[PDB]
Symmetry: C3
Subunit: 401 residues, 3 copies
Amino acid sequence: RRQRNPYHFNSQRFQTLYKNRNGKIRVLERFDQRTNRLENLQNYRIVEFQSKPNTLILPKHSDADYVIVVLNGRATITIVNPDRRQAYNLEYGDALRIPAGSTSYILNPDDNQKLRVVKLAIPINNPGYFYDFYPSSTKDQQSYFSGFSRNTLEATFNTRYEEIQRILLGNEDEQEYEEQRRGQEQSHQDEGVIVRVSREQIQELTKYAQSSSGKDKPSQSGPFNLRSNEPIYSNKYGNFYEITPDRNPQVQDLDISLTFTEINEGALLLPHYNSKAIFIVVVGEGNGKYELVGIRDQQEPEEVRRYSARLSEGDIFVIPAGYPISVNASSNLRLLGFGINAYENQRNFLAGSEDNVIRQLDREVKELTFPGSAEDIERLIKNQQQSYFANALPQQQQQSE
Amino acid sequence: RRQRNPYHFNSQRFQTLYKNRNGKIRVLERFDQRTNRLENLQNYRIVEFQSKPNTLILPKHSDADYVIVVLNGRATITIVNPDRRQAYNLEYGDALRIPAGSTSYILNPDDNQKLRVVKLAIPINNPGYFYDFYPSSTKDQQSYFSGFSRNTLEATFNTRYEEIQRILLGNEDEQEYEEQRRGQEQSHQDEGVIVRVSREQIQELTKYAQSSSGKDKPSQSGPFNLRSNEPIYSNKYGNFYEITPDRNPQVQDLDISLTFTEINEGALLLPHYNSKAIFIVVVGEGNGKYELVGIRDQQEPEEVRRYSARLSEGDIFVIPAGYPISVNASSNLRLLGFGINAYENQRNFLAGSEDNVIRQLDREVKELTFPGSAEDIERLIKNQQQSYFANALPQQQQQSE
Amino acid sequence: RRQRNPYHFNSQRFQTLYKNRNGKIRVLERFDQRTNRLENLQNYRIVEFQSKPNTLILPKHSDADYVIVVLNGRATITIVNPDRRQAYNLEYGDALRIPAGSTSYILNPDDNQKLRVVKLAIPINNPGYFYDFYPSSTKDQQSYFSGFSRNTLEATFNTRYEEIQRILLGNEDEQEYEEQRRGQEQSHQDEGVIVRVSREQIQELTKYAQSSSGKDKPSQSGPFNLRSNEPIYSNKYGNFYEITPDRNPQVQDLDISLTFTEINEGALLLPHYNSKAIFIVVVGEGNGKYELVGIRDQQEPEEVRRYSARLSEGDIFVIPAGYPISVNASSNLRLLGFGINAYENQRNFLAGSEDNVIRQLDREVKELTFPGSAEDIERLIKNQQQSYFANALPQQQQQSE
Ligand SMILES: [K+]
Ligand SMILES: [K+]
Ligand SMILES: [K+]
Ligand code: NA
Ligand code: NA
Ligand code: NA
């Protein structure tokens, strides 16, 4: 539409990196592609990863940090080190920092639930770009071991290339059949990087795992549910959870807050602005619209600019620091918030009866600030008795189907 | 002149953002406009803001940090939060960090003194660019509330748009008279973002205010006078004050030192270099010349480069780390220094008899370093018995008017 | 060769900045010249500095930090401050942070040993660019004092320009003879910035110096030998030393680890990857080859990319975080490692029997990960009983000369 939305990143702007019959691994366009208004976010990327019941992403390490949030189902994740090796179950809500270089792999042990993970990634080397290192050799990726010379591999493993090749790599087989339809496996596990897993294996693999279930609190060891603490804002229109970095060792070096806002249908996250935090917002569920307010630099009276977009499962949108936002709900809307620059943030609501900086003004300034009489503004301001969330005067039925 | 001055930012390179009859709000060209030698300063901007007696900037928040220094007069500043609301008087000399997102507004309660504020700003979102958010609706800026849809505003305030509009915004009135001359007000306060204020109001507004007067010391709460501590360098040619970040909680996260150098007429801030700190220097008062020394990369003997410029009330100039500087005074010259990267800085004077790194040399190296005999250099070096500042052999009168 | 090596910086890509008959001062091309894959290293530069016995670099300060490592011989370094003045002997192995702005100069007191220093530099002002400030006036560089005006110099030193000029600078002499051959001196010390020194002087100059000899431990005061601690990895194929930033006050603000890997002939630093650290690797001695593994983004099965290069005294190469590396040795190969982003790094070996993350995998995942049976992989993996370094099945003789 005339006057576009730089800050809106619909579902579609995910580029598939990897689809096989067991899961997908999408990544979102670089925040600074079309826009040049989102430069401070040049490093961050958003990955959605998805898998089907009883499945396994093969071991991977990346040149990037990861903050996992399970927006759907269960997974055991394992994280492997030079020294120890770990494993956590993770339920809906759970988040987890995978540091940069950790060998990890994620199993979906559920029997009928797809796994849905959304990852913020912070590249280490180059800005907006990381890569996935697999030891596995599939028809889809090769091992890094392949990038070594036979001599080097042979010294390395202390083994005839022919034995390495047979065991770690794979042999010459340069044709094709790849037709006919049913389902089974390939090589050993449904070929590719996302493979089908046996219960035998799920049982073995989960047996080590540190169970979540109980909503674990932001520590430095295991997963932490974004609903662990009591809502920060809670009433009968929604819930607002949030873990600020300073109270969360696992990410405090990344200076990320994480939020989980549930907006009930016909409800409205009343307008606020984030004082220093740039928020990357992720739709898990529901439908709605938002209104972000900017000053159109463009290039008489300084014009403000609404940047609106419909919302739905999968979309990303971004909230620049200082920019007032508000968010509707046609259907029960659930949002995941990655707040960059979040340490010391303060969310300033602009309506209703808490953290309302407009009311916190000096009487006589309200006076000078708005055309109404002082008293008219206290009354008006006070007409919204709900805080944080309210009713949005929703649409409904009447002579309608 | 042939061989320009990248580092000099005369008064003129201020772009007005806002002039009405009550004050101005200028901002300085981005440090990396013409030059590409000033990249590390790409984020910082310098705002001068000015107002006339009994006046008020309307409430504003920005997507940027602010370090205020009052180079002229008095002001009450208020800073408003989701929770509390504060207010300080500020006299000449006082500085104050306005964090990013703080609702603030500045009154000039004086009866005949113009208020002069110089702000370093550090944008949060985008590099070299911030914006001003006002709830006010004037003939000059609109409210961010205007960027919301009527439906959204109506849910928000819990009020008929028509009542919001009447009280918080303003109504349709699409013509003009804007002629005839006298002075009074407009709407309620002299229209625009800088408005005329009543004593009734000044009295009320200042009644909360935490008075400065007494030269408050670098804390984390209120304003701090850049002359609070005893001069760091003081003799009969000038005074050199400076608050390093590590001894100043309010900015220590920004890693800014602030200086206040008064150079007496015909005096001379002897040549030094800042070891890590990049200094942004601001002329409050007086006239003089400076000499900055660089190595002209250009593109036989490596050539050095003087970058000189006359000085006067309002000018900015910048001192790259490591680059030797010296500053004259035709008239009593008063400078405000924003030292970026200032934590652990050490100012190395190169003449006179303190912090003189040339004299700190090994005898026998002086020997090898300069053409003179060792003894000739100790004597010479020692011919300047004043430290830090000295006499500049000024110009004066003789058969002259 | 088709498919170039961005990460390889042979000896040749050093640009001489300064050669006279007493030493050279080379600097390496900006890590982001040809490549745009090395952006996070845009600031760092590598300087090799070399001098001949009984010599002196004249006093210099830079707008950049320095981490010195002596890869050959001995030096006294002096570091001069506004306040105190210091001096350390430094033997092979020793490293030292010269902060930004420290007046320093380096003497080579040895009688027959050339001094070889390799410096990582981190510019302060501009990214990839620093400059050298000398008070000396040679036929090669001028003093910064020259960049001041006569009036300014005269106030400064409190001396007739004609006396300054005679003692600190040098006088007009605008011709040439610069022929005939023997050796002696010029002006006072072999002209230029690197000069010939007397024993009389070496004796005097070293008399202050804090002797190294004993392998001093990472403190915050003096030089620290990169072999101070016991090897981190040691067996009969090499030694691997490393000082991580958190255990080394002098650099912990720079977040640099330093390594010293000695690979014995026919030995092999087995393949690993650095989890967060980007390593800048410097060849002191020996010959060999390396294999770095990357994912060629390029632009069916994701291709990996070997980036190989022969090695020899002087070469630089770089190891991106996460990228597996391995290094051979034709001759006793000695490497200096500048690990950027090194705080919390963990080196993951991929072969042999320590810190082997492949073996740390879950049995049943190895199962799914490689084509071999689980048991075949444990056996194979276990066929390399040496850790860290091993034998490379080297080349040798047979019907050969
Ligand atoms: K929010
Ligand atoms: K200064
Ligand atoms: K290494
Ligand atoms: Na063997
Ligand atoms: Na109502
Ligand atoms: Na005199």
